[PDB]
Design a protein around this ligand. Structure first.
Ligand SMILES: [K+]
Ligand SMILES: [K+]
Ligand SMILES: [Mg+2]
Ligand SMILES: [Mg+2]
Ligand SMILES: [Mg+2]
Ligand SMILES: [Mg+2]
Ligand SMILES: [Mg+2]
Ligand SMILES: [Mg+2]
Ligand SMILES: [Mg+2]
Ligand SMILES: [Mg+2]
Ligand SMILES: [Mg+2]
Ligand SMILES: [Mg+2]
Ligand SMILES: [Mg+2]
Ligand SMILES: [Mg+2]
Ligand SMILES: [Mg+2]
Ligand SMILES: [Mg+2]
Ligand SMILES: [Mg+2]
Ligand SMILES: [Mg+2]
Ligand SMILES: [Mg+2]
Ligand SMILES: [Mg+2]
Ligand SMILES: [Mg+2]
Ligand SMILES: [Mg+2]
Ligand SMILES: [Mg+2]
Ligand SMILES: [Mg+2]
Ligand SMILES: [Mg+2]
Ligand SMILES: [Mg+2]
Ligand SMILES: [Mg+2]
Ligand SMILES: [Mg+2]
Ligand SMILES: [Mg+2]
Ligand SMILES: [Mg+2]
Ligand SMILES: [Mg+2]
Ligand SMILES: [Mg+2]
Ligand SMILES: [Mg+2]
Ligand SMILES: [Mg+2]
Ligand SMILES: [Mg+2]
Ligand SMILES: [Mg+2]
Ligand SMILES: [Mg+2]
Ligand SMILES: [Mg+2]
Ligand SMILES: [Mg+2]
Ligand SMILES: [Mg+2]
Ligand SMILES: [Mg+2]
Ligand SMILES: [Mg+2]
Ligand SMILES: [Mg+2]
Ligand SMILES: [Mg+2]
Ligand SMILES: [Mg+2]
Ligand SMILES: [Mg+2]
Ligand SMILES: [Mg+2]
Ligand SMILES: [Mg+2]
Ligand SMILES: [Mg+2]
Ligand SMILES: [Mg+2]
Ligand SMILES: [Mg+2]
Ligand SMILES: [Mg+2]
Ligand SMILES: [Mg+2]
Ligand SMILES: [Mg+2]
Ligand SMILES: [Mg+2]
Ligand SMILES: [Mg+2]
Ligand SMILES: [Mg+2]
Ligand SMILES: [Mg+2]
Ligand SMILES: [Mg+2]
Ligand SMILES: [Mg+2]
Ligand SMILES: [Mg+2]
Ligand SMILES: [Mg+2]
Ligand SMILES: [Mg+2]
Ligand SMILES: [Mg+2]
Ligand SMILES: [Mg+2]
Ligand SMILES: [Mg+2]
Ligand SMILES: [Mg+2]
Ligand SMILES: [Mg+2]
Ligand SMILES: [Mg+2]
Ligand SMILES: [Mg+2]
Ligand SMILES: [Mg+2]
Ligand SMILES: [Mg+2]
Ligand SMILES: [Mg+2]
Ligand SMILES: [Mg+2]
Ligand SMILES: [Mg+2]
Ligand SMILES: [Mg+2]
Ligand SMILES: [Mg+2]
Ligand SMILES: [Mg+2]
Ligand SMILES: [Mg+2]
Ligand SMILES: [Mg+2]
Ligand SMILES: [Mg+2]
Ligand SMILES: [Mg+2]
Ligand SMILES: [Mg+2]
Ligand SMILES: [Mg+2]
Ligand SMILES: [Mg+2]
Ligand SMILES: [Mg+2]
Ligand SMILES: [Mg+2]
Ligand SMILES: [Mg+2]
Ligand SMILES: [Mg+2]
Ligand SMILES: [Mg+2]
Ligand SMILES: [Mg+2]
Ligand SMILES: [Mg+2]
Ligand SMILES: [Mg+2]
Ligand SMILES: [Mg+2]
Ligand SMILES: [Mg+2]
Ligand SMILES: [Mg+2]
Ligand SMILES: [Mg+2]
Ligand SMILES: [Mg+2]
Ligand SMILES: [Mg+2]
Ligand SMILES: [Mg+2]
Ligand SMILES: [Mg+2]
Ligand SMILES: [Mg+2]
Ligand SMILES: [Mg+2]
Ligand SMILES: [Mg+2]
Ligand SMILES: [Mg+2]
Ligand SMILES: [Mg+2]
Ligand SMILES: [Mg+2]
Ligand SMILES: [Mg+2]
Ligand SMILES: [Mg+2]
Ligand SMILES: [Mg+2]
Ligand SMILES: [Mg+2]
Ligand SMILES: [Mg+2]
Ligand SMILES: [Mg+2]
Ligand SMILES: [Mg+2]
Ligand SMILES: [Mg+2]
Ligand SMILES: [Mg+2]
Ligand SMILES: [Mg+2]
Ligand SMILES: [Mg+2]
Ligand SMILES: [Mg+2]
Ligand SMILES: [Mg+2]
Ligand SMILES: [Mg+2]
Ligand SMILES: [Mg+2]
Ligand SMILES: [Mg+2]
Ligand SMILES: [Mg+2]
Ligand SMILES: [Mg+2]
Ligand SMILES: [Mg+2]
Ligand SMILES: [Mg+2]
Ligand SMILES: [Mg+2]
Ligand SMILES: [Mg+2]
Ligand SMILES: [Mg+2]
Ligand SMILES: [Mg+2]
Ligand SMILES: [Mg+2]
Ligand SMILES: [Mg+2]
Ligand SMILES: [Mg+2]
Ligand SMILES: [Mg+2]
Ligand SMILES: [Mg+2]
Ligand SMILES: [Mg+2]
Ligand SMILES: [Mg+2]
Ligand SMILES: [Mg+2]
Ligand SMILES: [Mg+2]
Ligand SMILES: [Mg+2]
Ligand SMILES: [Mg+2]
Ligand SMILES: [Mg+2]
Ligand SMILES: [Mg+2]
Ligand SMILES: [Mg+2]
Ligand SMILES: [Mg+2]
Ligand SMILES: [Mg+2]
Ligand SMILES: [Mg+2]
Ligand SMILES: [Mg+2]
Ligand SMILES: [Mg+2]
Ligand SMILES: [Mg+2]
Ligand SMILES: [Mg+2]
Ligand SMILES: [Mg+2]
Ligand SMILES: [Mg+2]
Ligand SMILES: [Mg+2]
Ligand SMILES: [Mg+2]
Ligand SMILES: [Mg+2]
Ligand SMILES: [Mg+2]
Ligand SMILES: [Mg+2]
Ligand SMILES: [Mg+2]
Ligand SMILES: [Mg+2]
Ligand SMILES: [Mg+2]
Ligand SMILES: [Mg+2]
Ligand SMILES: [Mg+2]
Ligand SMILES: [Mg+2]
Ligand SMILES: [Mg+2]
Ligand SMILES: [Mg+2]
Ligand SMILES: [Mg+2]
Ligand SMILES: [Mg+2]
Ligand SMILES: [Mg+2]
Ligand SMILES: [Mg+2]
Ligand SMILES: [Mg+2]
Ligand SMILES: [Mg+2]
Ligand SMILES: [Mg+2]
Ligand SMILES: [Mg+2]
Ligand SMILES: [Mg+2]
Ligand SMILES: [Mg+2]
Ligand SMILES: [Mg+2]
Ligand SMILES: [Mg+2]
Ligand SMILES: [Mg+2]
Ligand SMILES: [Mg+2]
Ligand SMILES: [Mg+2]
Ligand SMILES: [Mg+2]
Ligand SMILES: [Mg+2]
Ligand SMILES: [Mg+2]
Ligand SMILES: [Mg+2]
Ligand SMILES: [Mg+2]
Ligand SMILES: [Mg+2]
Ligand SMILES: [Mg+2]
Ligand SMILES: [Mg+2]
Ligand SMILES: [Mg+2]
Ligand SMILES: [Mg+2]
Ligand SMILES: [Mg+2]
Ligand SMILES: [Mg+2]
Ligand SMILES: [Mg+2]
Ligand SMILES: [Mg+2]
Ligand SMILES: [Mg+2]
Ligand SMILES: [Mg+2]
Ligand SMILES: [Mg+2]
Ligand SMILES: [Mg+2]
Ligand SMILES: [Mg+2]
Ligand SMILES: [Mg+2]
Ligand SMILES: [Mg+2]
Ligand SMILES: [Mg+2]
Ligand SMILES: [Mg+2]
Ligand SMILES: [Mg+2]
Ligand SMILES: [Mg+2]
Ligand SMILES: [Mg+2]
Ligand SMILES: [Mg+2]
Ligand SMILES: [Mg+2]
Ligand SMILES: [Mg+2]
Ligand SMILES: [Mg+2]
Ligand SMILES: [Mg+2]
Ligand SMILES: [Mg+2]
Ligand SMILES: [Mg+2]
Ligand SMILES: [Mg+2]
Ligand SMILES: [Mg+2]
Ligand SMILES: [Mg+2]
Ligand SMILES: [Mg+2]
Ligand SMILES: [Mg+2]
Ligand SMILES: [Mg+2]
Ligand SMILES: [Mg+2]
Ligand SMILES: [Mg+2]
Ligand SMILES: [Mg+2]
Ligand SMILES: [Mg+2]
Ligand SMILES: [Mg+2]
Ligand SMILES: [Mg+2]
Ligand SMILES: [Mg+2]
Ligand SMILES: [Mg+2]
Ligand SMILES: [Mg+2]
Ligand SMILES: [Mg+2]
Ligand SMILES: [Mg+2]
Ligand SMILES: [Mg+2]
Ligand SMILES: [Mg+2]
Ligand SMILES: [Mg+2]
Ligand SMILES: [Mg+2]
Ligand SMILES: [Mg+2]
Ligand SMILES: [Mg+2]
Ligand SMILES: [Mg+2]
Ligand SMILES: [Mg+2]
Ligand SMILES: [Mg+2]
Ligand SMILES: [Mg+2]
Ligand SMILES: [Mg+2]
Ligand SMILES: [Mg+2]
Ligand SMILES: [Mg+2]
Ligand SMILES: [Mg+2]
Ligand SMILES: [Mg+2]
Ligand SMILES: [Mg+2]
Ligand SMILES: [Mg+2]
Ligand SMILES: [Mg+2]
Ligand SMILES: [Mg+2]
Ligand SMILES: [Mg+2]
Ligand SMILES: [Mg+2]
Ligand SMILES: [Mg+2]
Ligand SMILES: [Mg+2]
Ligand SMILES: [Mg+2]
Ligand SMILES: [Mg+2]
Ligand SMILES: [Mg+2]
Ligand SMILES: [Mg+2]
Ligand SMILES: [Mg+2]
Ligand SMILES: [Mg+2]
Ligand SMILES: [Mg+2]
Ligand SMILES: [Mg+2]
Ligand SMILES: [Mg+2]
Ligand SMILES: [Mg+2]
Ligand SMILES: [Mg+2]
Lengths: 48, 275
RNA sequence: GCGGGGUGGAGCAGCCUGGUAGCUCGUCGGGCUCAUAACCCGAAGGUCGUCGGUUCAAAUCCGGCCCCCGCAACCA
RNA sequence: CCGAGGGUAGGGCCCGUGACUGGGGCGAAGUCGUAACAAGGUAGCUGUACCGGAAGGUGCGGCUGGAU
RNA sequence: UGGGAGAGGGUGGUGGAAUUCCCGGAGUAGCGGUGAAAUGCGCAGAUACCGGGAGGAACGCCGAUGGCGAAGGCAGCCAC
RNA sequence: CGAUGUCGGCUCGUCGCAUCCUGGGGCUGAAGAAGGUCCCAAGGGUUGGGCUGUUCGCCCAUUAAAGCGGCACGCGAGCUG
RNA sequence: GAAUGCCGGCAUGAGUAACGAUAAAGAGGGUGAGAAUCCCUCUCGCCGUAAGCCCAAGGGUUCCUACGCAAUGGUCGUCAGCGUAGGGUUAGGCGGGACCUAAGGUGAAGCCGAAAGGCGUAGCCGAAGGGCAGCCGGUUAAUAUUCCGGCCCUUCCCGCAGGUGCGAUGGGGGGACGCUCUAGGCUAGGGGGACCGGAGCCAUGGACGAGCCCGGCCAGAAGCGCAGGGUGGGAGGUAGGCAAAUCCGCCUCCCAACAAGCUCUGCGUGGUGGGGAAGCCCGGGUGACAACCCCCCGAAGCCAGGGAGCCAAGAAAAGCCUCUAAGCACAACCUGCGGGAACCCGUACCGCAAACCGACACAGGUGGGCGGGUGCAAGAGCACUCAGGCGCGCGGGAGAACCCUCGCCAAGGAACUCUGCAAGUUGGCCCCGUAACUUCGGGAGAAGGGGUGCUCCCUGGGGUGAUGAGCCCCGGGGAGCCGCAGUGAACAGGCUCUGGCGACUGUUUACCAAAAACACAGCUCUCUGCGAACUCGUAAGAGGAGGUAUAGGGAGCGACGCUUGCCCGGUGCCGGAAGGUCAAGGGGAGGGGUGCAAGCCCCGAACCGAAGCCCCGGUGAACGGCGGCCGUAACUAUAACGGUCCUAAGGUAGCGAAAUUCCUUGUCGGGUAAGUUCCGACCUGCACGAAAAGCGUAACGACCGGAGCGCUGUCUCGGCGAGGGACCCGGUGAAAUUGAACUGGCCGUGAAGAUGCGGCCUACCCGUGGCAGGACGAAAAGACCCCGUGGAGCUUUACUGCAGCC
RNA sequence: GAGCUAGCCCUGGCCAGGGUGAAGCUGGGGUGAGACCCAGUGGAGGCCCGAACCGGUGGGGGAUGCAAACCCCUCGGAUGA
């Protein structure tokens, strides 16, 4: 049946993307946190 | 004269439609339409602030001319009478001798191809538009400004009217479609005659689907929900109201007056509505 | 199992707050009418379901008994 | 081939009967009231409407087959 | 052909009297109702009195034992 | 109660005997035939249907007879629901 | 040494289940150390509105080639979507950007909010919508509207010529629109040809034929031809389109109108450029100077912005055309012609799937286009079949029980069972024919019946063509033939009577309930006069609505018919300027503290003093409620009638053992041989009753009852058969569970149901196929129940607050 | 976090083929004129049958599954809410 992951690159980037995070106080904290933990990618990789 | 159908389906048994006899033109004046944004009852927060709305026919909004002191003394001819899906009434297309074209709502009896006019000197005649102080006492009147130069606010729906009871200073006494006696300022423009399409309330929507076309979504009774949803929710089996019948938001809904008690316009209402 | 009730012939007061049994109808005698009813004037009939106790004194207060209506008997 | 009739299916008319139900007729001495005949004690009748244990009553309009 | 009477019918218009209600005034101890009363209404200012307003319905006098209509029935006044 | 699945039905049986039938007896208010009551006896048998979820019970048509109880109200790692 | 401990390791079950659609396989030949599994050939089966082909999303080298087989592949592997390496994606015209706008996002102005931030006009961003210039063939192992070949076209810059009042971010036009139905003419696509081209073939009894088989086209500028779309021309006035305007709008006059003319598309033709089958020979070569024509069917696509009808009344902005404004008219714009200029990103491969989403090469999910032929009334239905693609990544045997999926059945025919559950039956078309009832539509495919193939003869009408032949589509009549059977295979209603509920089509608990529930048109109450009420928000601001009482909110009821009674004492709401009570505040009789005193400081009664509350009224389609005992008639029985107590008033019409009736399987009637169900009545209604609507109601229902006909393996009562499993052999190989185990029956005993204790009885050791009585078998720290001064959802005249409102 | 799901907004797309035959319109009859009747033409509808597509009614299988909702046989809607 229809599962819950239906990939969409525009939807992925307009929702979790770098610019989506920077626009919002909570988003900037995600970047600050994932940067402080040392994550290799701060943001989902989507091929655009 | 509302139109009936034979009962060749269940729904055609009682469905009635308007006869559209007065209509003389079937597509709008391109220079006078502009797109109507459907809201689905949602406000700018994205939130339903009016339940049960949405999903009706697409419409073009037709720019109606509710101020007619815009063109005092310039007579217009009545070019056509047209279907407006944004209001219960039919609208009339006017060609002023200026060449400017405009829309008004069409009073009862208005004849396609007749002269209408606005101004303190206009003839007391179906379609003309004088400030209230020059219209004779006892006249039926429609599209009435509430305040001078603010726009026709009163008596705009199909078949409705207002009657002038008397004058008292810078003010006249109107009996509204609701039956209330109000004091409206004399310099407020109005339009002699009653709004047309008086048969509009005799329409029988006929079936659920016809209401969906008009943008009305199904309306679910409080008594059918659960307590988390509505004062009438819950109960094992059916249930009487079990309290003063109330809205979803708590307040009583059988008799509770809701007009603000200290509203400035209270000084201008002589009698609340009948009936 | 929890509750209320039982008093002239009928239906009800008085019981809480001990000493005084009351109201309407009915029944009995007379009146009026040709006569009956209605109406008017008078009268009788209740030891207060019962046994026991409390008290100077019990329809009344407290117990046991007979009765007569009720409300209830849910989770499996 | 037609063909008495036989068989399956579905109709129409009549008759008999049926728990129960409706009013009707009749029946020496039943219970309740007193509607009508006198202005019958609210003049009667009336078509309709609603109501009421019952006769009836009331509204609207009609008739004199109404008295003084 | 020329004339006459008429609440004959239909439409639209409109005139005064009255009842009710509403607002202003003035005013106070009762009003109303009946066989008699009571319900009811009234010092939260009624009834009675003047001025204003709204609204519906019916047309006093003329009016008759009258007139019109096929009947049912038709009455302020005005035009068609 | 860190679970022993709870009515009935179906299937499959097995046992008890306080015996419904069939076998053997005594008494009879046992003439015969057919009954009644008690004793012995558990080998075998103990039907098909209508109604209701029903157990049970009533009813139809038979029968030699249409027994009553136990097996976790026998049997859901056998079925049903 | 125990914590259903934690981490890891290795056991058990076990060589067990399984190896993922039952579309299906067999042989020969290759390669290789090794072959059921890789390659080739022949035979067989399967998909064919796909199981074929092409786009988009998503995936991201999976594509091609060479060399490999440790791991991955459910077996094998020499193969592979696997390992190593090399190669591969080419555009002015396809898609997107350098163009436009939609919701929405954002946001100079501006508004609001402790901070963070939230709004918001224009503007900007935003596409699968608008706009915009490429078609055919060839080539590579792998890209191709991209490379090459042919024939076409677009923009930008510059130049030349001719013309022109040129000029825009501004004005106007246009772009520009729905749903159903639909005309004419085309094309796509297809069928036939006794015409044209073709390697051949003659079998096995006949056939050298008007024989079989194969094929008979694609693209194209100007011009031309057919069919369509769009479009009035001149003039005079002008005050409107937020400056101007010769444009546009309005008025008048002349002329032109189902035309013509101009313009623009589609189709046809068209200089040219291509392509081109079977079959044979090794993807190719030949065929081949291949031929390339006629008739018919014919779109849902094209002409297209076409036509008609209807109501629910159907985007924007740019490109484009026109009008002018500053400005400038040595300029600029328009037309024609020429040379030059033309950038960035995508392009491999998969794509109904073994490469996407489902942890798997997973019987599931995934949007658009093409989707051939014959027959069956039609069709994308069904059977077979083309092109093309496949046999589903374990096989070989055997022929038990048992399970699954399937076929048949003597006599009976619901006797099965909670229930005809299930499975039969019926089944398409054509004609005959069809009841109660009804809202006149219906009920209706009611019911029930008859026909249905093949052959010959006669014949009526249409389409194309021409009016004929041919082809093609509807038919009518007569005579015959065959079989058990003619919708001969596949696809394709069982029907009727009767209740309950709900009017109806609709909607619902994704994943145990599809219903009688929700919705619904309709009816009623109530709020709301507009800066509305109401709703979201601290606010600004939104929605309501660019709506205005024939409107919008809330509430109940729920098509329709006939109807909806009595109670306002309590609660709610509405009304009520009196009176009562009432907080802050006003007032300040009268006191008090202190100081030498002036003074400073505190207490403070009467009285004035909102809403709310009381108090007086109204109000039921507001919350709600609508009695008890006793007596009475000339047989009895029962009470129309009376008596009395209580109420705010004592249930009206109509229904009634009911989705409601406890006693209850009430009583009677019907249906049955028999009826706790069912249907019709009765009425002492435990405990109906009128918008939580009362009583009916044609029609409708995958709802729930009851009956009958039909037909049946449901059953008496089971039998046989098929295939996939199970079973045996080779390969690969789990699981939950498990204190350890050398793990019998009876009668007892025991924490009261013992393989483990006692006594007796029985039993040689170890397996395999089977059955499920036990191991209080497995699973899940019982949902029930209680306990915890544990938790959470919900309610209210529980407490206490808060938003909101007054 | 609305790439599942529920609703709404904008913009596109999809619904084989059969059946029934409303209003209107045309003609004929009828009347003082009408209503109205009949035939044709017409193509209405939360209309009828049935693929796609959307569903999920009954039964059976599956139940350490092909699948953490599947498969088979039946069945509902299919121009509309
Ligand atoms: K337990
Ligand atoms: K319980
Ligand atoms: Mg889903
Ligand atoms: Mg999605
Ligand atoms: Mg995307
Ligand atoms: Mg996208
Ligand atoms: Mg997206
Ligand atoms: Mg999205
Ligand atoms: Mg976002
Ligand atoms: Mg972003
Ligand atoms: Mg920050
Ligand atoms: Mg990481
Ligand atoms: Mg790094
Ligand atoms: Mg992130
Ligand atoms: Mg109608
Ligand atoms: Mg009209
Ligand atoms: Mg526009
Ligand atoms: Mg809006
Ligand atoms: Mg937001
Ligand atoms: Mg709302
Ligand atoms: Mg809404
Ligand atoms: Mg309108
Ligand atoms: Mg309106
Ligand atoms: Mg005013
Ligand atoms: Mg209405
Ligand atoms: Mg609408
Ligand atoms: Mg509702
Ligand atoms: Mg509810
Ligand atoms: Mg509920
Ligand atoms: Mg909630
Ligand atoms: Mg609540
Ligand atoms: Mg409630
Ligand atoms: Mg409820
Ligand atoms: Mg409920
Ligand atoms: Mg209830
Ligand atoms: Mg109620
Ligand atoms: Mg209640
Ligand atoms: Mg209640
Ligand atoms: Mg309330
Ligand atoms: Mg409020
Ligand atoms: Mg008012
Ligand atoms: Mg007594
Ligand atoms: Mg008394
Ligand atoms: Mg007392
Ligand atoms: Mg005393
Ligand atoms: Mg007497
Ligand atoms: Mg005593
Ligand atoms: Mg004593
Ligand atoms: Mg409980
Ligand atoms: Mg129990
Ligand atoms: Mg015959
Ligand atoms: Mg015979
Ligand atoms: Mg016969
Ligand atoms: Mg009398
Ligand atoms: Mg009399
Ligand atoms: Mg009398
Ligand atoms: Mg009388
Ligand atoms: Mg009366
Ligand atoms: Mg007084
Ligand atoms: Mg006073
Ligand atoms: Mg009035
Ligand atoms: Mg355990
Ligand atoms: Mg357990
Ligand atoms: Mg059985
Ligand atoms: Mg014997
Ligand atoms: Mg003897
Ligand atoms: Mg004897
Ligand atoms: Mg025996
Ligand atoms: Mg039984
Ligand atoms: Mg039992
Ligand atoms: Mg019983
Ligand atoms: Mg015997
Ligand atoms: Mg037993
Ligand atoms: Mg047990
Ligand atoms: Mg058991
Ligand atoms: Mg027991
Ligand atoms: Mg079980
Ligand atoms: Mg069981
Ligand atoms: Mg059991
Ligand atoms: Mg078990
Ligand atoms: Mg059950
Ligand atoms: Mg069940
Ligand atoms: Mg230890
Ligand atoms: Mg632990
Ligand atoms: Mg662990
Ligand atoms: Mg481990
Ligand atoms: Mg390790
Ligand atoms: Mg291990
Ligand atoms: Mg071991
Ligand atoms: Mg092992
Ligand atoms: Mg084993
Ligand atoms: Mg085995
Ligand atoms: Mg397994
Ligand atoms: Mg498997
Ligand atoms: Mg299959
Ligand atoms: Mg199969
Ligand atoms: Mg197949
Ligand atoms: Mg072979
Ligand atoms: Mg090798
Ligand atoms: Mg191999
Ligand atoms: Mg090998
Ligand atoms: Mg194979
Ligand atoms: Mg091969
Ligand atoms: Mg095909
Ligand atoms: Mg397959
Ligand atoms: Mg991937
Ligand atoms: Mg390997
Ligand atoms: Mg190897
Ligand atoms: Mg290696
Ligand atoms: Mg492997
Ligand atoms: Mg392997
Ligand atoms: Mg695998
Ligand atoms: Mg290997
Ligand atoms: Mg490549
Ligand atoms: Mg190119
Ligand atoms: Mg550039
Ligand atoms: Mg843009
Ligand atoms: Mg913002
Ligand atoms: Mg911040
Ligand atoms: Mg900010
Ligand atoms: Mg954007
Ligand atoms: Mg953009
Ligand atoms: Mg685009
Ligand atoms: Mg392009
Ligand atoms: Mg081209
Ligand atoms: Mg090509
Ligand atoms: Mg110019
Ligand atoms: Mg321009
Ligand atoms: Mg347009
Ligand atoms: Mg438009
Ligand atoms: Mg568009
Ligand atoms: Mg429409
Ligand atoms: Mg072509
Ligand atoms: Mg064809
Ligand atoms: Mg002017
Ligand atoms: Mg050659
Ligand atoms: Mg299409
Ligand atoms: Mg088109
Ligand atoms: Mg058109
Ligand atoms: Mg816009
Ligand atoms: Mg200048
Ligand atoms: Mg110059
Ligand atoms: Mg030019
Ligand atoms: Mg660039
Ligand atoms: Mg490519
Ligand atoms: Mg592909
Ligand atoms: Mg599929
Ligand atoms: Mg597809
Ligand atoms: Mg594929
Ligand atoms: Mg593939
Ligand atoms: Mg993969
Ligand atoms: Mg999964
Ligand atoms: Mg596979
Ligand atoms: Mg798959
Ligand atoms: Mg073909
Ligand atoms: Mg067919
Ligand atoms: Mg494929
Ligand atoms: Mg074997
Ligand atoms: Mg067969
Ligand atoms: Mg048989
Ligand atoms: Mg039978
Ligand atoms: Mg039979
Ligand atoms: Mg049966
Ligand atoms: Mg059932
Ligand atoms: Mg069935
Ligand atoms: Mg019948
Ligand atoms: Mg019938
Ligand atoms: Mg009919
Ligand atoms: Mg038929
Ligand atoms: Mg038939
Ligand atoms: Mg029927
Ligand atoms: Mg025949
Ligand atoms: Mg034949
Ligand atoms: Mg069939
Ligand atoms: Mg069928
Ligand atoms: Mg019943
Ligand atoms: Mg329904
Ligand atoms: Mg109903
Ligand atoms: Mg109904
Ligand atoms: Mg309904
Ligand atoms: Mg439907
Ligand atoms: Mg569910
Ligand atoms: Mg659920
Ligand atoms: Mg779920
Ligand atoms: Mg769930
Ligand atoms: Mg289910
Ligand atoms: Mg349910
Ligand atoms: Mg359903
Ligand atoms: Mg209704
Ligand atoms: Mg709020
Ligand atoms: Mg607020
Ligand atoms: Mg707005
Ligand atoms: Mg409802
Ligand atoms: Mg009522
Ligand atoms: Mg009350
Ligand atoms: Mg009251
Ligand atoms: Mg009250
Ligand atoms: Mg003082
Ligand atoms: Mg006060
Ligand atoms: Mg009450
Ligand atoms: Mg109550
Ligand atoms: Mg007696
Ligand atoms: Mg009544
Ligand atoms: Mg009853
Ligand atoms: Mg009964
Ligand atoms: Mg009933
Ligand atoms: Mg019930
Ligand atoms: Mg009841
Ligand atoms: Mg009981
Ligand atoms: Mg009962
Ligand atoms: Mg019972
Ligand atoms: Mg019985
Ligand atoms: Mg009875
Ligand atoms: Mg019915
Ligand atoms: Mg019905
Ligand atoms: Mg249904
Ligand atoms: Mg249903
Ligand atoms: Mg049944
Ligand atoms: Mg039956
Ligand atoms: Mg069988
Ligand atoms: Mg077999
Ligand atoms: Mg062996
Ligand atoms: Mg292996
Ligand atoms: Mg394990
Ligand atoms: Mg051991
Ligand atoms: Mg052992
Ligand atoms: Mg042993
Ligand atoms: Mg014990
Ligand atoms: Mg033991
Ligand atoms: Mg032992
Ligand atoms: Mg031991
Ligand atoms: Mg021992
Ligand atoms: Mg031992
Ligand atoms: Mg021993
Ligand atoms: Mg033994
Ligand atoms: Mg075994
Ligand atoms: Mg066992
Ligand atoms: Mg077992
Ligand atoms: Mg066991
Ligand atoms: Mg067990
Ligand atoms: Mg725990
Ligand atoms: Mg626990
Ligand atoms: Mg526990
Ligand atoms: Mg638990
Ligand atoms: Mg407990
Ligand atoms: Mg406590
Ligand atoms: Mg405690
Ligand atoms: Mg607690
Ligand atoms: Mg909870
Ligand atoms: Mg809590
Ligand atoms: Mg999405
Ligand atoms: Mg469709
Ligand atoms: Mg037909
Ligand atoms: Mg026709
Ligand atoms: Mg027409
Ligand atoms: Mg339909
Ligand atoms: Mg249907
Ligand atoms: Mg049909
Ligand atoms: Mg299913
Ligand atoms: Mg079935
Ligand atoms: Mg499951
Ligand atoms: Mg399935
Ligand atoms: Mg199927
Ligand atoms: Mg179906
Ligand atoms: Mg259908
Ligand atoms: Mg269809």
């Amino acid at each position: 049946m229809k599962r819950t992951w239906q990939p969409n690159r525009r939807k992925r980037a307009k929702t979790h993307g770098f610019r989506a995070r920077m626009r919002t106080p909570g988003g900037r904290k995600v970047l600050k946190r994932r940067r402080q933990k040392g994550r290799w990618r701060l943001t989902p990789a989507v091929r655009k | 004269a509302v139109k009936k159908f034979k009962p060749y389906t269940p729904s055609r048994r009682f469905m009635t439609v308007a006869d559209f006899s007065e209509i003389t033109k079937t597509e709008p004046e391109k220079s006078l339409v502009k797109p109507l944004k459907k809201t689905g009852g949602r406000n700018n927060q994205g939130r339903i602030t009016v339940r049960f709305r949405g999903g009706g026919h697409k419409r073009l909004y037709r720019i109606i001319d509710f101020k007619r002191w815009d063109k005092v003394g310039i007579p217009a001819k009545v070019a056509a009478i047209e279907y407006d899906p944004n209001r219960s009434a039919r609208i009339a297309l006017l060609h002023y001798v200026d060449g400017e074209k405009r829309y008004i709502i069409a009073p009862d009896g208005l004849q396609v191809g007749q002269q209408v006019v606005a101004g303190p000197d206009a003839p007391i005649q179906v379609g003309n538009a004088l400030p209230l102080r020059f219209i004779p006492v006892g006249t039926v009147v429609h599209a009435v400004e509430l305040e001078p130069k603010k726009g026709a606010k009163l008596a705009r729906a199909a078949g409705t009217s207002a009657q002038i009871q008397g004058r008292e200073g810078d003010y006249v006494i109107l009996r509204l479609p609701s039956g209330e006696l109000r004091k409206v300022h004399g310099e407020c423009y109005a339009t002699v005659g009653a709004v047309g399409n008086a048969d509009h309330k005799n329409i029988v929507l006929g079936k659920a689907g016809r209401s969906r076309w008009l943008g009305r979504r199904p309306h679910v009774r409080g008594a059918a929900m659960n307590p988390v949803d509505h004062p009438h929710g819950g109960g094992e089996g059916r249930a009487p109201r079990g309290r003063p019948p109330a809205s979803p938001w708590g307040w009583q809904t059988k008799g509770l007056k809701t007009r603000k008690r200290r509203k400035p316009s209270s000084r201008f209402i002589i009698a609340r509505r009948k009936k």
